[PDB]
Amino acid sequence: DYDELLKYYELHETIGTGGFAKVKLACHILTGEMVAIKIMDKNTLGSDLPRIKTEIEALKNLRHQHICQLYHVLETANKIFMVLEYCPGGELFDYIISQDRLSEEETRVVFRQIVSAVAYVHSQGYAHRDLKPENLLFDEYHKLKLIDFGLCGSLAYAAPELIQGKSYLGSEADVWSMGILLYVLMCGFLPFDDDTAAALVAKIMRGKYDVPKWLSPSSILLLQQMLQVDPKKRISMKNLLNHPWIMQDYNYPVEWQSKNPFIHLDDDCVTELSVHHRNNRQTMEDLISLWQYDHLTATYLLLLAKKARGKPVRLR
Ligand SMILES: COc1cc(OCC#Cc2ccc3ccncc3c2)ccc1C[NH+]1CC[NH2+]CC1
């Protein structure tokens, strides 16, 4: 049901077409700020509902310039609504297809932002496990924002040890997938590809792939370090952050740390919320500090975004 949602948000156009989910552009009424709302059906989700809730819980603990920001989670009889940072530039998937393949220097700029996000995810004790172009969006500055739940599919990006149900480290699986991503960025097609799941997979397990003639020697060396079938021989995130290829154009290690972490509550945002809710500062801070990802969380976070853009920190 939509009763609660529409008290807080005005719905605009659909932006996301999917199979288990829809995505709507929306306006957050109190702040006037645009958001994307992902709409998931519980019946559709079935016994994956508890897994989806565990992931939403993980997203609540991520705060990062290259990770899509969560504002609000609203659950009803049949739906879960996720209110997220609107990324207007669309999927990296569509960008790659539109350009054929990216120059080495553009792929480096983009790949550094992927590494930044993923390194941060690992630092917080998590792994993504479904990295692929459909799970990376561009914002209006053409900076990447990591998402999940975007839809042989992601089989082509799955690490061999992942593919055969065996024991694996999430971080190592993410490095493999980042290797596939690197290849597609520079080539515009997959390193392992086929018409059937059995064939695609055999290919993945063998680890052999063509090396198009336009790939630089240094690109080739990095790809072989990321696409090692044996996870033990795969390059670590530590060594990726300051890899020679990664630093070839911009001679600094990847800035993976959050640039915007939550330290203490922003006083200006607390002030505006206090006047609006007719509360004193202490009781308002106490409410916000629960971090329930309810409408209050959403309003706090959206006021914070307003302040970052130099806009009056004000509620309509
Ligand atoms: C980065 O971690 C997560 C991201 C998640 O994203 C959900 C979404 C979205 C989305 C879809 C379409 C859009 C269109 C326009 N603008 C914004 C849009 C946003 C969800 C969950 C996680 C948590 N993560 C999952 C993988 N394992 C580690 C935790």
Side-chain angles (χ1 to χ4, degrees):
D1 194 77
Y2 280 70
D3 212 76
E4 191 174 355
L5 193 68
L6 297 173
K7 289 184 146 199
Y8 303 132
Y9 301 96
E10 275 165 299
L11 265 32
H12 297 39
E13 51 178 354
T14 303
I15 65 215
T17 177
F20 65 82
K22 319 133 181 291
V23 181
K24 282 166 188 304
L25 178 63
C27 187
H28 180 257
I29 306 315
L30 269 191
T31 61
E33 293 294 320
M34 299 305 114
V35 298
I37 306 177
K38 184 177 181 58
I39 306 159
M40 306 178 88
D41 194 77
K42 291 176 181 181
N43 296 35
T44 301
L45 283 173
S47 69
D48 273 290
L49 182 279
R51 171 187 136 268
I52 297 311
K53 273 175 168 191
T54 304
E55 300 315 290
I56 287 163
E57 215 60 29
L59 180 53
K60 289 175 186 183
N61 294 289
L62 302 174
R63 165 63 164 196
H64 194 275
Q65 62 273 15
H66 293 303
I67 299 174
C68 189
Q69 180 61 231
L70 182 69
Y71 298 125
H72 192 170
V73 179
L74 194 40
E75 183 174 354
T76 71
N78 296 97
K79 302 291 187 208
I80 300 179
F81 298 101
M82 298 182 62
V83 183
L84 295 309
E85 175 180 8
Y86 172 46
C87 303
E91 292 170 22
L92 174 63
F93 178 86
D94 296 294
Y95 185 63
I96 291 169
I97 289 203
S98 79
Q99 310 299 129
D100 186 8
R101 66 207 199 222
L102 308 195
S103 65
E104 193 171 332
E105 27 294 82
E106 189 174 0
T107 113
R108 219 172 256 117
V109 165
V110 160
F111 197 71
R112 284 175 65 105
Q113 303 168 43
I114 298 167
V115 170
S116 173
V118 175
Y120 170 82
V121 170
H122 298 174
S123 74
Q124 297 313 112
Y126 304 108
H128 190 284
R129 296 178 180 92
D130 197 14
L131 297 173
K132 61 185 168 164
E134 295 87 336
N135 282 148
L136 290 152
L137 279 24
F138 283 110
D139 71 2
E140 64 274 29
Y141 295 96
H142 209 74
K143 305 285 184 94
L144 280 181
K145 302 285 178 162
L146 182 61
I147 62 163
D148 200 357
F149 312 156
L151 251 65
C152 289
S154 52
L155 181 53
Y157 292 86
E161 70 271 17
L162 189 308
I163 290 307
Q164 50 195 295
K166 69 159 285 123
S167 291
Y168 75 93
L169 279 184
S171 63
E172 290 174 342
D174 283 346
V175 167
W176 171 277
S177 303
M178 290 192 298
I180 306 295
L181 270 169
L182 179 59
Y183 189 97
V184 304
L185 282 164
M186 292 193 297
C187 293
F189 47 77
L190 296 155
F192 314 102
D193 199 327
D194 232 318
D195 304 313
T196 70
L200 209 204
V201 171
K203 282 177 163 189
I204 291 165
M205 301 311 180
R206 215 96 348 113
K208 264 250 65 189
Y209 54 82
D210 301 323
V211 184
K213 198 172 182 180
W214 58 83
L215 281 64
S216 64
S218 71
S219 281
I220 293 170
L221 291 161
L222 180 51
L223 285 158
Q224 66 181 67
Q225 286 180 289
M226 307 188 73
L227 298 178
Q228 288 290 145
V229 169
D230 183 350
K232 171 176 79 258
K233 297 181 183 196
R234 231 109 91 197
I235 192 170
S236 62
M237 187 60 44
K238 177 184 163 70
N239 289 149
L240 200 53
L241 291 168
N242 71 167
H243 196 275
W245 185 94
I246 280 277
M247 290 174 54
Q248 201 177 115
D249 296 332
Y250 184 70
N251 195 209
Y252 301 91
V254 170
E255 302 167 19
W256 64 267
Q257 294 107 129
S258 172
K259 289 193 200 312
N260 52 186
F262 304 122
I263 292 169
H264 294 317
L265 264 17
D266 182 273
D267 291 344
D268 296 331
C269 295
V270 170
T271 295
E272 182 65 8
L273 260 9
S274 300
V275 312
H276 185 261
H277 287 105
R278 310 174 91 181
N279 292 328
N280 60 252
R281 181 175 308 276
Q282 191 55 247
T283 89
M284 196 69 258
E285 282 182 3
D286 284 346
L287 263 341
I288 297 161
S289 290
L290 256 15
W291 289 96
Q292 290 189 58
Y293 286 80
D294 58 359
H295 184 60
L296 175 59
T297 303
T299 310
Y300 174 76
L301 289 174
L302 288 172
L303 279 177
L304 201 58
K306 274 190 149 208
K307 216 246 270 250
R309 277 139 68 243
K311 296 212 290 205
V313 41
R314 295 295 198 74
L315 258 12
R316 80 146 209 70

